[PDB]
Coordinates of C-alpha atoms (C1' of nucleotides) in Angstrom, one line a residue:
Chain A
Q14 CA 72.3 80.6 46.1
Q15 CA 74.9 78.9 48.2
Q16 CA 77.6 76.0 47.8
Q17 CA 80.7 77.6 46.3
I18 CA 84.0 75.6 46.6
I19 CA 86.9 77.4 48.4
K20 CA 89.8 74.9 49.0
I21 CA 89.5 74.6 52.6
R22 CA 92.3 73.4 55.1
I23 CA 91.8 71.7 58.4
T24 CA 94.6 71.3 60.9
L25 CA 94.2 68.8 63.6
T26 CA 96.5 69.1 66.6
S27 CA 96.5 67.0 69.7
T28 CA 98.6 65.1 72.6
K29 CA 96.3 61.9 72.4
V30 CA 97.0 60.0 69.2
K31 CA 93.9 57.9 69.3
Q32 CA 91.5 60.8 69.4
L33 CA 93.3 62.5 66.7
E34 CA 93.1 59.5 64.4
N35 CA 89.5 59.1 65.2
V36 CA 88.7 62.7 64.3
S37 CA 91.0 62.4 61.2
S38 CA 89.3 59.2 60.0
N39 CA 85.9 61.0 60.9
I40 CA 86.6 63.9 58.6
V41 CA 88.2 61.8 55.8
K42 CA 85.2 59.5 55.7
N43 CA 82.7 62.5 56.2
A44 CA 84.4 64.0 53.0
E45 CA 84.5 61.1 50.9
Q46 CA 81.0 59.8 52.0
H47 CA 79.5 62.6 49.9
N48 CA 82.3 63.2 47.6
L49 CA 84.7 66.0 48.3
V50 CA 88.3 66.0 46.9
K51 CA 91.1 65.8 49.5
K52 CA 94.8 66.0 50.0
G53 CA 94.4 63.5 52.8
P54 CA 95.7 63.7 56.4
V55 CA 99.3 64.6 56.3
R56 CA 101.1 63.5 59.5
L57 CA 103.5 66.2 60.6
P58 CA 106.5 65.3 62.6
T59 CA 105.4 64.7 66.2
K60 CA 107.1 67.1 68.4
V61 CA 108.4 66.1 71.8
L62 CA 108.4 68.8 74.4
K63 CA 111.3 67.7 76.8
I64 CA 111.6 69.3 80.3
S65 CA 114.6 67.9 82.3
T66 CA 114.5 68.7 85.9
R67 CA 116.3 67.4 89.1
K68 CA 114.2 64.9 91.1
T69 CA 115.0 66.4 94.4
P70 CA 113.5 69.7 96.0
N71 CA 116.6 70.3 98.0
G72 CA 120.2 69.5 96.7
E73 CA 121.0 66.6 98.8
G74 CA 121.5 63.2 97.3
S75 CA 123.1 61.7 94.2
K76 CA 122.1 64.0 91.1
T77 CA 119.1 62.2 89.6
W78 CA 117.6 63.8 86.5
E79 CA 114.1 63.4 85.2
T80 CA 113.1 64.0 81.6
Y81 CA 109.3 64.6 81.2
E82 CA 108.0 65.0 77.8
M83 CA 104.6 65.9 76.1
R84 CA 104.1 64.6 72.6
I85 CA 102.2 66.7 70.2
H86 CA 100.9 65.3 67.0
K87 CA 99.6 67.4 63.9
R88 CA 97.7 66.6 60.8
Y89 CA 96.1 68.7 58.0
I90 CA 93.5 67.9 55.3
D91 CA 93.0 70.0 52.3
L92 CA 89.4 69.7 51.2
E93 CA 87.4 71.2 48.4
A94 CA 84.1 71.6 50.0
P95 CA 81.0 73.7 49.5
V96 CA 80.4 76.5 52.2
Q97 CA 77.5 74.6 53.6
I98 CA 79.5 71.5 53.6
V99 CA 82.4 73.5 55.2
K100 CA 80.1 74.6 58.0
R101 CA 79.0 71.0 58.6
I102 CA 82.3 69.5 58.9
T103 CA 83.8 72.4 60.8
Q104 CA 81.3 72.4 63.6
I105 CA 81.1 68.5 63.9
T106 CA 84.1 66.4 64.9
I107 CA 84.6 68.0 68.3
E108 CA 86.5 65.7 70.7
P109 CA 87.8 66.3 74.2
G110 CA 91.5 66.9 73.4
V111 CA 91.7 67.6 69.8
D112 CA 92.2 71.1 68.4
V113 CA 90.9 72.0 65.1
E114 CA 91.7 75.1 63.0
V115 CA 90.0 75.8 59.7
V116 CA 91.3 78.2 57.2
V117 CA 90.3 79.1 53.7
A118 CA 92.1 80.7 50.7
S119 CA 95.0 78.6 49.8
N120 CA 96.9 81.5 48.2
Chain B
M1 CA 92.5 100.2 105.4
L2 CA 92.6 104.0 104.8
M3 CA 90.9 104.6 101.5
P4 CA 88.5 107.0 99.9
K5 CA 84.8 106.5 100.4
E6 CA 84.4 106.9 96.7
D7 CA 86.7 103.8 96.2
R8 CA 85.2 101.9 99.0
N9 CA 81.7 102.2 97.5
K10 CA 83.3 101.3 94.0
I11 CA 84.5 98.0 95.6
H12 CA 81.2 97.5 97.3
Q13 CA 79.2 98.4 94.2
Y14 CA 81.0 96.0 92.1
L15 CA 80.7 93.3 94.7
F16 CA 76.9 93.7 95.1
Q17 CA 76.6 93.8 91.4
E18 CA 78.6 90.8 90.6
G19 CA 78.5 88.7 93.8
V20 CA 82.1 87.5 93.1
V21 CA 85.4 89.2 92.5
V22 CA 88.7 87.6 91.5
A23 CA 91.8 89.5 92.5
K24 CA 95.5 88.7 91.9
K25 CA 97.8 88.7 94.8
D26 CA 99.7 91.6 93.5
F27 CA 100.0 94.7 95.7
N28 CA 101.3 98.0 94.0
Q29 CA 99.3 97.2 90.8
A30 CA 97.5 100.5 90.7
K31 CA 94.6 99.2 88.6
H32 CA 92.6 96.1 89.5
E33 CA 90.9 94.3 86.6
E34 CA 87.3 95.4 86.1
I35 CA 87.5 97.9 89.0
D36 CA 89.1 101.4 88.7
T37 CA 91.0 101.4 91.9
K38 CA 94.2 99.9 93.2
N39 CA 94.5 96.2 93.5
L40 CA 95.4 96.8 97.1
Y41 CA 92.3 98.7 97.9
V42 CA 90.3 95.6 96.4
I43 CA 92.2 93.0 98.5
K44 CA 92.1 94.8 101.7
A45 CA 88.5 96.0 101.5
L46 CA 87.5 92.5 100.8
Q47 CA 89.6 91.2 103.8
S48 CA 88.0 93.7 106.0
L49 CA 84.7 92.2 104.8
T50 CA 85.8 88.7 105.4
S51 CA 86.5 89.3 109.1
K52 CA 82.8 90.2 109.7
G53 CA 81.2 87.4 107.7
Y54 CA 79.7 88.7 104.6
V55 CA 82.3 87.1 102.1
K56 CA 84.5 84.2 101.8
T57 CA 88.0 83.8 100.3
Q58 CA 89.8 81.0 98.6
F59 CA 93.5 81.4 97.7
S60 CA 94.4 79.0 95.0
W61 CA 97.6 79.9 93.0
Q62 CA 98.2 83.7 93.8
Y63 CA 94.6 84.9 92.9
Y64 CA 92.1 85.7 95.7
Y65 CA 88.6 84.4 94.9
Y66 CA 86.0 86.4 96.8
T67 CA 82.4 85.1 97.2
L68 CA 79.7 87.2 98.5
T69 CA 77.5 85.4 101.2
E70 CA 74.0 86.1 102.0
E71 CA 74.7 88.0 105.3
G72 CA 76.8 90.2 103.0
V73 CA 74.1 90.5 100.5
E74 CA 71.7 91.8 103.3
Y75 CA 74.7 94.1 104.6
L76 CA 75.5 95.8 101.4
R77 CA 72.0 96.1 100.2
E78 CA 71.7 98.0 103.4
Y79 CA 75.0 99.8 102.9
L80 CA 74.4 100.8 99.2
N81 CA 70.8 101.4 100.3
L82 CA 69.2 99.6 97.2
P83 CA 65.6 98.3 97.4
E84 CA 65.1 94.6 98.4
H85 CA 65.1 92.1 95.5
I86 CA 67.7 94.0 93.4
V87 CA 70.9 92.3 93.0
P88 CA 73.6 90.2 93.1
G89 CA 73.9 87.4 90.5
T90 CA 71.7 84.8 92.3
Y91 CA 70.5 84.5 88.7
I92 CA 67.6 82.4 87.2
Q93 CA 69.2 83.3 83.8
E94 CA 67.1 83.1 80.6
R95 CA 69.3 81.3 78.2
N96 CA 71.4 79.4 80.7
Chain C
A19 CA 49.8 113.5 118.3
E20 CA 48.9 113.7 114.6
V21 CA 51.7 115.9 113.0
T22 CA 55.4 115.9 113.0
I23 CA 57.6 118.5 115.0
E24 CA 60.5 119.0 112.8
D25 CA 60.8 115.3 112.1
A26 CA 60.1 116.3 108.6
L27 CA 63.6 117.9 108.9
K28 CA 64.9 114.7 110.3
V29 CA 63.6 112.7 107.4
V30 CA 65.0 115.1 104.7
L31 CA 68.3 115.1 106.5
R32 CA 68.2 111.2 106.7
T33 CA 67.6 111.1 102.9
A34 CA 70.2 113.8 102.5
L35 CA 72.9 111.4 103.8
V36 CA 72.5 108.6 101.7
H37 CA 73.0 110.1 98.3
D38 CA 76.0 112.0 99.4
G39 CA 74.9 115.6 99.9
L40 CA 74.8 116.1 103.6
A41 CA 77.7 118.4 104.0
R42 CA 78.1 118.3 107.8
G43 CA 80.6 120.0 110.0
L44 CA 81.4 123.7 110.2
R45 CA 84.2 123.7 107.7
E46 CA 82.7 121.3 105.2
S47 CA 79.5 123.4 105.1
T48 CA 80.9 126.9 104.9
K49 CA 83.0 125.5 102.0
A50 CA 79.7 124.5 100.4
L51 CA 78.1 128.0 101.1
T52 CA 81.1 129.8 99.5
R53 CA 80.2 128.2 96.0
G54 CA 76.7 127.8 94.6
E55 CA 76.0 124.5 96.0
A56 CA 74.0 125.2 99.2
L57 CA 70.4 124.2 99.0
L58 CA 69.2 124.1 102.6
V59 CA 71.2 125.3 105.6
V60 CA 70.7 124.2 109.1
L61 CA 72.5 125.8 112.0
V62 CA 71.9 125.7 115.7
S63 CA 71.5 128.1 118.5
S64 CA 73.4 127.0 121.7
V65 CA 76.9 127.5 120.9
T66 CA 79.5 129.5 122.9
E67 CA 80.7 133.0 121.7
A68 CA 78.6 132.6 118.6
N69 CA 81.0 133.7 115.8
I70 CA 80.2 130.4 114.3
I71 CA 76.6 131.3 114.2
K72 CA 77.6 134.9 113.1
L73 CA 79.7 133.5 110.2
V74 CA 77.2 130.9 108.9
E75 CA 74.3 133.5 109.3
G76 CA 76.3 136.0 107.4
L77 CA 77.2 133.5 104.6
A78 CA 73.8 132.1 104.2
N79 CA 71.9 135.3 104.2
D80 CA 73.8 137.2 101.6
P81 CA 71.6 139.5 99.4
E82 CA 72.5 137.2 96.6
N83 CA 70.6 133.9 96.0
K84 CA 69.9 130.5 97.9
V85 CA 68.7 131.8 101.1
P86 CA 67.1 129.2 103.5
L87 CA 67.8 128.5 107.3
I88 CA 66.4 127.0 110.5
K89 CA 67.8 127.7 113.9
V90 CA 66.7 124.5 115.9
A91 CA 68.9 123.8 119.0
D92 CA 70.6 120.6 120.2
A93 CA 73.7 120.0 117.8
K94 CA 74.0 116.5 119.5
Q95 CA 70.3 115.9 118.4
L96 CA 71.4 117.3 115.1
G97 CA 74.2 114.7 115.1
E98 CA 71.6 111.9 115.9
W99 CA 69.4 113.2 113.0
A100 CA 72.5 114.3 110.7
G101 CA 74.8 111.3 110.2
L102 CA 76.0 109.1 113.1
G103 CA 73.8 106.2 113.9
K104 CA 75.4 103.6 116.2
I105 CA 72.2 102.2 117.2
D106 CA 72.8 98.7 118.9
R107 CA 69.1 98.1 120.0
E108 CA 68.3 101.6 118.7
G109 CA 66.9 103.0 121.9
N110 CA 69.7 105.4 121.4
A111 CA 72.7 103.6 123.1
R112 CA 75.2 105.3 120.7
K113 CA 78.3 107.6 121.0
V114 CA 76.6 110.6 119.5
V115 CA 78.6 113.9 119.0
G116 CA 77.3 117.3 117.8
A117 CA 77.0 118.6 114.4
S118 CA 75.8 122.2 114.7
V119 CA 75.9 123.0 110.8
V120 CA 74.4 120.7 108.2
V121 CA 74.0 121.8 104.5
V122 CA 72.2 119.7 102.0
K123 CA 73.4 119.4 98.4
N124 CA 71.1 118.1 95.5
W125 CA 69.0 116.0 98.3
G126 CA 68.9 113.4 95.5
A127 CA 65.1 112.6 95.8
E128 CA 61.7 113.9 95.3
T129 CA 58.5 115.1 97.0
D130 CA 56.5 115.8 100.2
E131 CA 58.5 116.8 103.1
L132 CA 61.2 118.5 101.0
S133 CA 58.3 120.7 99.7
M134 CA 56.8 121.0 103.1
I135 CA 59.8 122.8 104.7
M136 CA 60.7 124.3 101.4
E137 CA 57.4 126.2 101.2
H138 CA 57.4 126.6 105.1
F139 CA 60.6 128.6 104.8
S140 CA 60.5 130.1 101.3
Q141 CA 57.0 131.5 101.7
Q142 CA 55.5 133.2 104.7
Chain D
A2 CA 95.3 83.5 68.7
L3 CA 99.0 84.1 67.5
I4 CA 100.2 81.5 70.0
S5 CA 102.3 78.5 68.8
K6 CA 101.1 75.0 69.3
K7 CA 103.8 74.3 71.9
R8 CA 102.8 77.2 74.0
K9 CA 99.1 76.8 73.2
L10 CA 98.9 73.1 74.3
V11 CA 101.1 73.8 77.3
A12 CA 98.8 76.6 78.4
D13 CA 95.9 74.3 77.9
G14 CA 97.4 71.9 80.3
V15 CA 98.2 74.7 82.7
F16 CA 94.7 76.0 82.6
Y17 CA 93.5 72.3 83.4
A18 CA 95.8 72.1 86.5
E19 CA 94.8 75.5 87.7
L20 CA 91.2 74.5 87.3
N21 CA 91.9 71.3 89.2
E22 CA 93.6 73.0 92.0
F23 CA 90.9 75.7 92.2
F24 CA 88.2 73.1 92.5
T25 CA 90.0 70.9 94.8
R26 CA 90.1 73.9 97.2
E27 CA 86.7 75.3 96.5
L28 CA 84.7 72.0 96.3
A29 CA 86.5 69.8 98.7
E30 CA 83.6 69.2 101.0
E31 CA 81.3 67.9 98.2
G32 CA 83.9 65.3 97.1
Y33 CA 85.1 66.9 94.0
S34 CA 86.8 64.1 92.0
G35 CA 88.1 65.8 88.9
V36 CA 87.2 68.0 86.0
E37 CA 87.4 67.5 82.2
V38 CA 87.3 70.5 80.0
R39 CA 86.0 70.3 76.3
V40 CA 86.7 73.2 74.0
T41 CA 84.0 73.6 71.4
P42 CA 83.3 76.6 69.1
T43 CA 81.9 79.5 71.1
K44 CA 82.0 77.6 74.4
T45 CA 84.5 76.0 76.7
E46 CA 82.8 73.3 78.9
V47 CA 84.1 72.4 82.4
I48 CA 82.4 69.1 83.5
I49 CA 82.8 68.9 87.3
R50 CA 82.7 65.5 88.6
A51 CA 81.8 65.6 92.2
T52 CA 79.9 62.9 94.0
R53 CA 77.6 65.3 95.8
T54 CA 76.0 67.4 93.1
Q55 CA 73.2 68.4 95.2
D56 CA 75.6 70.5 97.2
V57 CA 77.7 71.6 94.1
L58 CA 74.6 73.0 92.4
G59 CA 72.7 74.7 95.2
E60 CA 69.5 76.4 95.3
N61 CA 68.5 76.4 91.7
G62 CA 72.1 76.4 90.6
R63 CA 73.2 79.3 92.7
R64 CA 76.6 77.8 93.6
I65 CA 77.5 76.6 90.1
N66 CA 76.7 80.2 88.8
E67 CA 79.2 81.4 91.2
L68 CA 81.8 79.0 89.9
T69 CA 81.1 79.8 86.3
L70 CA 81.6 83.6 87.3
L71 CA 84.8 82.8 89.1
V72 CA 86.3 80.9 86.2
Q73 CA 85.2 83.4 83.6
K74 CA 86.6 86.2 85.6
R75 CA 89.9 84.9 86.5
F76 CA 90.9 83.2 83.2
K77 CA 89.1 86.4 81.4
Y78 CA 86.7 84.6 79.2
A79 CA 83.9 86.7 77.8
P80 CA 80.6 85.9 79.8
Chain E
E3 CA 101.0 108.4 95.4
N4 CA 104.4 107.1 96.8
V5 CA 107.0 107.4 94.2
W6 CA 109.4 105.8 96.5
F7 CA 108.2 102.2 96.8
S8 CA 109.5 101.0 93.3
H9 CA 112.6 100.2 91.4
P10 CA 113.0 98.7 87.9
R11 CA 112.2 95.1 87.6
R12 CA 111.9 94.5 83.8
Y13 CA 114.3 91.5 83.9
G14 CA 116.4 89.2 86.0
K15 CA 115.2 86.8 88.7
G16 CA 113.1 89.3 90.7
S17 CA 110.9 90.1 87.7
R18 CA 109.2 86.9 87.5
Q19 CA 108.2 84.1 89.9
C20 CA 106.2 80.8 90.1
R21 CA 102.6 81.1 89.4
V22 CA 101.8 78.3 92.0
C23 CA 103.9 79.6 95.0
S24 CA 105.5 83.0 94.2
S25 CA 109.0 81.5 94.4
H26 CA 111.7 83.2 92.5
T27 CA 114.5 80.7 92.5
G28 CA 114.4 77.6 90.1
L29 CA 111.7 78.6 87.6
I30 CA 110.9 76.5 84.4
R31 CA 110.4 79.1 81.7
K32 CA 110.5 76.7 78.9
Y33 CA 107.4 77.1 76.8
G34 CA 106.4 79.8 79.1
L35 CA 104.9 77.7 81.8
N36 CA 106.6 79.6 84.5
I37 CA 106.3 77.2 87.3
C38 CA 109.3 76.4 89.6
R39 CA 110.9 73.0 89.4
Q40 CA 109.4 71.6 92.6
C41 CA 105.9 72.7 91.7
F42 CA 106.3 71.5 88.1
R43 CA 107.3 68.1 89.6
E44 CA 103.7 68.0 91.2
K45 CA 101.7 69.6 88.5
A46 CA 103.5 67.7 85.7
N47 CA 100.9 65.0 85.0
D48 CA 98.2 67.5 85.0
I49 CA 99.8 69.8 82.5
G50 CA 100.5 66.7 80.3
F51 CA 104.1 65.9 80.9
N52 CA 104.6 62.2 81.4
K53 CA 107.6 60.0 81.9
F54 CA 108.3 57.7 79.1
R55 CA 112.1 57.2 78.9
Chain F
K95 CA 102.0 115.6 113.0
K96 CA 98.8 117.7 112.5
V97 CA 99.1 120.9 114.6
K98 CA 95.4 121.2 115.1
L99 CA 93.8 124.5 114.9
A100 CA 91.2 126.6 116.7
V101 CA 88.6 126.6 114.0
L102 CA 88.4 127.8 110.5
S103 CA 86.9 131.2 111.0
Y104 CA 89.1 133.1 108.6
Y105 CA 86.4 135.3 107.2
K106 CA 85.7 138.7 108.4
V107 CA 82.0 138.8 109.0
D108 CA 80.8 142.4 109.9
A109 CA 77.5 143.3 111.5
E110 CA 74.6 142.4 109.3
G111 CA 75.4 140.7 107.1
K112 CA 78.4 141.4 105.1
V113 CA 81.0 138.6 104.7
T114 CA 84.5 138.8 103.3
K115 CA 86.8 136.2 101.9
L116 CA 90.2 136.8 103.5
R117 CA 93.0 134.6 102.1
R118 CA 91.9 134.7 98.5
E119 CA 91.1 131.5 96.7
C120 CA 92.5 129.1 94.2
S121 CA 92.0 130.0 90.6
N122 CA 92.6 126.5 89.3
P123 CA 89.8 124.9 87.4
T124 CA 89.9 121.7 89.9
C125 CA 89.3 124.1 92.9
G126 CA 85.9 125.9 92.6
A127 CA 87.1 128.7 94.7
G128 CA 86.0 127.2 98.0
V129 CA 89.5 126.2 99.0
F130 CA 92.0 129.0 100.4
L131 CA 95.5 129.7 99.6
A132 CA 98.0 129.6 102.3
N133 CA 100.3 132.7 102.8
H134 CA 103.8 131.8 104.0
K135 CA 106.7 134.1 103.1
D136 CA 104.9 135.4 99.7
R137 CA 104.3 132.0 99.0
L138 CA 100.7 131.9 98.0
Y139 CA 100.2 128.2 98.0
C140 CA 97.2 125.8 97.3
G141 CA 96.5 122.9 99.5
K142 CA 93.9 121.2 97.4
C143 CA 96.3 121.0 94.4
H144 CA 98.4 119.1 96.9
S145 CA 101.7 119.9 95.1
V146 CA 101.1 122.3 92.2
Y147 CA 100.0 126.0 92.0
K148 CA 102.3 128.0 94.2
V149 CA 101.7 131.5 93.4
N150 CA 103.9 134.6 93.9
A151 CA 101.8 137.1 95.8
Chain G
rG1 C1' 118.9 73.5 89.7
rG2 C1' 123.1 78.6 93.5
rG3 C1' 126.3 81.2 85.8
rA4 C1' 124.3 86.6 92.6
rA5 C1' 126.3 94.3 89.4
rA6 C1' 120.4 96.3 91.1
rC7 C1' 116.1 92.2 92.1
rU8 C1' 117.2 87.6 93.6
rC9 C1' 118.7 88.2 99.2
rA10 C1' 117.8 85.4 103.5
rC11 C1' 124.0 89.5 105.5
rC12 C1' 125.8 94.8 106.7
rA13 C1' 125.2 100.7 107.2
rG14 C1' 121.2 103.8 106.9
rG15 C1' 115.9 106.0 105.3
rU16 C1' 110.4 104.8 104.3
rC17 C1' 105.5 102.4 104.7
rC18 C1' 101.4 99.2 107.6
rA19 C1' 99.6 96.2 103.7
rG20 C1' 98.3 96.4 112.7
rA21 C1' 91.6 92.2 110.1
rC22 C1' 87.6 92.3 113.6
rA23 C1' 85.4 93.7 118.3
rC24 C1' 85.3 96.8 122.8
rA25 C1' 86.8 101.4 125.2
rA26 C1' 88.6 106.4 124.6
rU27 C1' 89.0 111.2 121.4
rA28 C1' 86.1 114.0 117.9
rA29 C1' 82.4 117.2 113.4
rG30 C1' 83.7 123.7 117.6
rG31 C1' 87.4 118.2 113.2
rA32 C1' 88.9 111.7 114.6
rU33 C1' 92.5 111.9 110.5
rU34 C1' 95.0 112.2 105.2
rG35 C1' 98.3 114.9 102.1
rA36 C1' 101.7 118.9 100.7
rC37 C1' 104.6 123.7 97.4
rA38 C1' 109.3 126.2 98.7
rG39 C1' 113.4 126.2 102.4
rA40 C1' 116.3 123.8 106.3
rU41 C1' 117.3 118.4 106.3
rU42 C1' 118.6 113.8 103.9
rG43 C1' 122.4 109.7 99.6
rA44 C1' 117.7 111.1 97.3
rG45 C1' 112.6 115.8 93.4
rA46 C1' 111.0 110.2 100.9
rG47 C1' 106.7 116.7 103.4
rC48 C1' 110.9 110.8 106.6
rU49 C1' 111.4 115.3 110.3
rC50 C1' 111.1 120.9 111.3
rU51 C1' 109.2 126.6 110.0
rU52 C1' 104.4 127.8 108.1
rU53 C1' 99.3 127.3 106.9
rC54 C1' 96.7 125.4 103.5
rU55 C1' 94.1 120.9 102.4
rU56 C1' 91.4 116.5 103.9
rG57 C1' 86.5 114.5 106.2
rA58 C1' 84.9 109.9 109.8
rU59 C1' 87.9 105.8 105.6
rU60 C1' 91.3 106.8 110.1
rU61 C1' 94.3 107.6 115.3
rU62 C1' 95.2 106.0 121.1
rG63 C1' 94.9 101.6 124.8
rU64 C1' 93.1 96.3 125.4
rG65 C1' 92.0 91.4 123.6
rG66 C1' 92.8 89.2 119.0
rG67 C1' 95.0 88.6 114.0
rU68 C1' 98.2 88.9 109.8
rG69 C1' 103.2 88.5 107.8
rG70 C1' 108.4 86.1 108.4
rU71 C1' 114.2 82.8 103.0
rG72 C1' 113.1 83.6 111.8
rG73 C1' 114.2 78.6 115.1
rU74 C1' 113.8 73.4 115.8
rG75 C1' 114.2 68.5 109.4
rC76 C1' 115.7 65.4 116.8
rA77 C1' 107.8 67.9 116.3
rU78 C1' 105.8 66.9 111.3
rG79 C1' 103.5 66.0 105.9
rG80 C1' 105.2 65.7 100.6
rC81 C1' 109.2 64.9 97.7
rC82 C1' 114.3 62.8 97.1

RNA sequence: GGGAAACUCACCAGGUCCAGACACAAUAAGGAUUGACAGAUUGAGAGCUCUUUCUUGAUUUUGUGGGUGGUGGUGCAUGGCC
């Protein structure tokens, strides 16, 4: 016997917003299309990693500065899924550039 | 390089067995990853092999990438005295 | 011919190199005799003042165990048979030096010619 | 594991830049034009895009097995 | 075997170096990328550091 | 600078066939009584243990 | 990206090490060569060097060609960046 519900948690973190929203939309439809219950995709505050460096390799010139930045977007979906449907949704929704981390046991 | 024959055969055994060795450009490390000699013995024995054919080297971000060639495969199946059709991973791997 | 005139010795020494048991040299070999590692000892005859022969003949023929020998000449041919091949179109063309004592340890191998000279010395 | 998402995604970028430099040196003759890397469960995939894959692969994939071995040694993946 | 070839380098500037070019001076150690400023300026689009504002 | 030697013939071999181990051997477990101990000024000293085991003798 | 106690460090007063590939020629298993306790010595528990006498075992040493390294020079030989 299989299919017990466990209150699973998906965390989706990425640097490309479109692939992240495609995978989040993927999971929310792939939960609702066969009827889980969900605390749907909660947008966390997008963190901006800034690195400020001089433009020049030597020290000559007027001091010009350069602020590179990498944006990082997170989401998390709380589902209540049976362990088979857990396995199904956890293996699927792979994307180049989206990171999925799935935890159990909401205590 | 002056090094023990035990360690030179350790390097050459690992190189014939693997066909390939990565090695951090870090002298005075006292332990190579996956060989139990110095890192310097690895780097210098592989260089002494490079000058006589037998292996090629790329550098690429502080990490010597050594790759055994065919002339080397002959030379150190001769040197380790294994029978023909024994080794390095010229592999026709089952699951890959 | 049809037989091999101490080239059986050449073959067991050539196999004795490669699994690390051919202790060659005077000092390396007399250090092997003074512990229980010696399995087959090979000296030579044509040396000068023969205290080297005297020492290795005393230490290999103790009246305690492990007692073989052979007295074949030509330490330089014992070098071409023992461990230094610098062939280069192997009609010899090499820089060969003499060896004059060679001692075999564990001979890591098997049958025939081992057994041939083993019976040939250790049963008369 | 036990790396923050800042450090993890930065190290994923640094792993991509390292792979790109290593392949720009190793496969420059075959016209290597850029990798992409896809993490999956149990496998991380490295799609080389060269133009001359008949000389990236080799005799029954002998060359790409070396590159798989090189990358799995240097970044210490399990084989 | 030489115990006269070393000296403590647990910290400072000589303890660490750029992983691209082994340079000591001018590292970027933010988020542990440990590239110097000049090689970061080249590898920045590959690491994923883009110039927006 | 490696002062050379004549040979190592530091055994007293008598006539037929008794040998004797002059300069008694190292007792340490990592030196299977093949190596010798040097005798400087009372200084019994092992060379295979490259540093350790200087004996008083 | 220069807020340098050591490192950085490129300067000074000194001591180590070769990390001198490869090939040739020489020496040489009657040992080519490695290392070292204690003392003198040195800033130093560096056997660096010496007394000495063990160890080591073809890896190395000596000469030639030829390499490698250099925060050495020329930014008025250049790339790239600024």
